[PDB]
């Protein structure tokens, strides 16, 4: 008797077992536990060596179990109706906090249980970054261990006391300190290896803002252009074709003939084919929603419309040319003022967002100060045609508008390809 | 649209970075009052619950600084007795006894 | 290669289908092909030298044989800097004094690669000598007037003689269809 | 654009090659500076880098 | 072991620094845990100016 071990089971008797799902699944364990908590005694784990041992009674289960884990490590669990029964209470943490003074307050008074010294600004920049982190205005990141991370880096950065100098300080060199491949890529833009236009109108192509596989955090901008040739309506995504996209329909690709073949309907069928192509093949492409860039950049190459270039175009849209909210909203800004500070700030360059996205714009303090500036431009759009007006800088209605000079391009590809058909007669 | 600066300003405004605050801490779960009312009604029922939540939400944590702060009457005490050479059954007495 | 679609494949099919609008589509089909095993080809980017050799043998063009051509291409033709440049260089280089330098062998490649361009010094050496000569090109239009030796607008200019060509091949590709007719 | 022979020279002159050098160690991480403070901020505060 | 020593887990008061290169580490930044103990990085670009 006075070699049975106590385990978790016995140390917990009238009190709470905390356990982790997660350990639960990975090492098998949760089916023994199950049936001890159903059957609500248990004996302690013997060994198969035993010639008979000894005769255990079954110890009492007198606790309150709580498992913790994450929603993919309870996903594995909630399947029998066994869980469910088991465990009633589902106690769910939002990832993210009301931003509010309340919680501002709440999140200093927590960093100063932690031990930190925190002063006012400090403080400030602390839950500020913590919004930044939850890529919303108005929530403050719920991760307090990463905000504690950061908080410990500032420290360090600033002698132990956390003023909003040390925190910027904290910011600034994690950030730094991933940026490599940003560093490599602006080189690349300044030295020429890649080509981008910040300056002047092009037709038929945008700076559409991507974010990196390489850095699934940095934003950058991309040329991404679009060829009108006469022929079938079809619409070809090179970088969603390239092997593996001719017989697999991509949403993307549905969704801009969807908009452009319902939009301009003057002929029986869009009698245009467009190409839409990145260069710089460091853009991972989504095949599962439609970017606003490619939109503006096929209805620049239909009617022949010089964009301008200074402007960066993101946002997904949908087939009737609503703009929709797209993430990574604050790095892709950032992205382009970026590579747009490198080759200098022209005074009207500028990024093109969904008004949706608004509410996750959330800016580094230098974008901020060249917008206060003026150096910087950020247009809220909820319609493609209105990107259209912002870039080809001309309305879509009345004479010598956007939308009469798409059709009338329309109509110059529908000529030619009815000669192609003057030919298949004559 | 043309985004004015001040619809684009977000970060809150700073008076004084030169001010060492004074705070006390805050509930456990702040923020948190979905998890926390959960776990209030699995500690008062006696239900077995389950925290759920993104990684480094430092759930764990709070969850032991929680129940720490709790107070349950005071369990009995637990042992294993022999009652004889192979058979040990379990007894509980009065909580210190043991 | 039967549903595979190329991505330098579909590059240089945008440009030329873009590019020349005359015809409900391009009237023409080119075939390319390196005439070697040695060579490793990039499925994935549309070569320079695959977009001059396509307008040369649509429109007829004789090019100059004496300049290498290397480079990347989009569908607007614009052309991209690549990889190796250097060793690219070099080795034309070795050719061309192999058989002896003429005088007038060079390379055209990408402007985007003027950052990467550590010729040897032999290669500077000759291009100091006036013995080698490296032509940067942004678009693939410069590099089709420097090999062509002609410029692209204007009477008797390389776009000219290209739309001639396109106009030949569908006066033909309509020529079977007149036979269609009777 | 044919490229000038200055406009490709990239090799740096030698203006004397028979002189033996004597020349400081470098700091460590020399040319790596982001590398060299993310070591000095992971040695200041103990962290794990 | 029949039974082994009952001995004291050996207190780590080091500090880790993993090196190795990008495509390493990379399947090692799946875990929470491993950006939560190694937070800082201290990367080396493969040129220097």
């Avoid at chain 1, 905390?18 to 001890?36: C, V, Y």
């Avoid at chain 1, 620049?300 to 609503?322: C, E, F, H, Y």
């Avoid at chain 1, 800016?363 to 759009?381: P, S």
Wanted: negative net charge.
């Amino acid at each position: 008797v006075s070699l049975i071990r106590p385990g978790a089971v016995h140390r917990a008797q009238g009190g709470y077992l905390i356990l982790d799902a997660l350990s639960l699944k990975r090492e098998g364990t949760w089916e023994a536990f199950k049936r001890a908590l159903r059957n609500g005694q248990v004996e302690p784990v013997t060994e198969p060596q035993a010639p008979a041992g000894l005769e255990v009674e079954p110890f009492p289960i007198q606790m309150q179990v709580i498992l913790v884990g994450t929603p993919e490590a309870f996903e594995g669990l909630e399947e029998d109706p066994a869980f469910s029964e088991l465990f009633r209470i589902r106690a769910e943490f939002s990832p993210t906090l009301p931003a509010s003074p309340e919680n501002c307050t709440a999140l200093g008074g927590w960093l100063l249980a932690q031990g930190f010294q925190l002063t006012q600004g400090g403080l400030t920049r602390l839950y500020d970054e913590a919004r930044r982190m939850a890529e919303q205005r108005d929530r403050m990141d719920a991760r307090l261990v990463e905000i504690r991370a950061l908080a410990e880096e500032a420290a360090v950065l600033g002698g132990g006391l956390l003023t909003a100098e040390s925190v910027e300080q904290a910011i600034a060199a994690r950030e730094h300190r991933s940026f490599l491949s940003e560093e490599e890529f602006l080189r690349a833009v300044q030295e020429g290896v890649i080509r981008l236009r910040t300056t002047g109108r092009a037709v038929g192509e945008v700076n559409s803002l991507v974010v990196v596989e390489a850095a699934p955090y940095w934003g950058r901008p991309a040329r991404l252009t679009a060829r009108a040739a006469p022929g079938r309506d079809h619409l070809i995504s090179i970088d969603r074709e390239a092997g593996l996209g001719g017989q697999i329909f991509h949403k993307a690709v549905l969704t801009l003939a969807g908009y452009l073949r319902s939009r301009y309907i003057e002929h029986g069928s869009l009698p245009v084919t467009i190409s839409l192509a990145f260069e710089q093949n460091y853009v991972s492409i989504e095949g599962d929603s439609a970017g606003l860039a490619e939109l503006v950049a096929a209805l620049s190459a239909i009617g022949n419309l010089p964009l301008r270039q200074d402007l960066a175009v993101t946002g997904a849209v949908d087939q009737t040319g609503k703009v929709l909210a797209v993430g990574a909203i604050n790095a892709k800004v950032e992205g382009f003022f970026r590579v747009c500070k490198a080759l200098g700030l022209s005074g009207t360059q500028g990024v093109i967002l969904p008004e949706a996205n608004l509410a996750n714009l959330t800016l580094r303090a230098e974008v901020l100060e060249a917008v206060r500036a003026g150096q910087f431009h950020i247009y809220a759009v909820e319609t493609a045609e209105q990107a259209l007006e912002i870039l080809a800088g001309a309305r879509m209605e009345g004479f010598r508008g956007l939308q009469e000079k798409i059709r009338a391009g329309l109509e110059a590809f529908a000529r030619l390809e009815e000669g192609h058909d003057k030919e298949d007669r004559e | 649209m043309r985004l004015s600066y001040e619809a684009l300003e977000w970060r809150t405004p700073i008076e004084n970075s030169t001010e060492p605050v004074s705070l006390p801490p805050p509930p456990p779960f702040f923020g948190q009052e979905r998890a926390r009312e959960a776990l209030e009604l699995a500690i008062r029922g006696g239900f077995h619950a389950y925290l759920v939540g993104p990684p480094s939400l430092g759930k764990h944590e709070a969850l032991l600084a929680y129940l720490s702060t709790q107070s349950v009457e005071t369990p009995p005490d637990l042992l294993y007795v022999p009652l004889s050479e192979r058979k040990v059954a379990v007894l509980t007495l009065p909580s210190g006894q043991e």
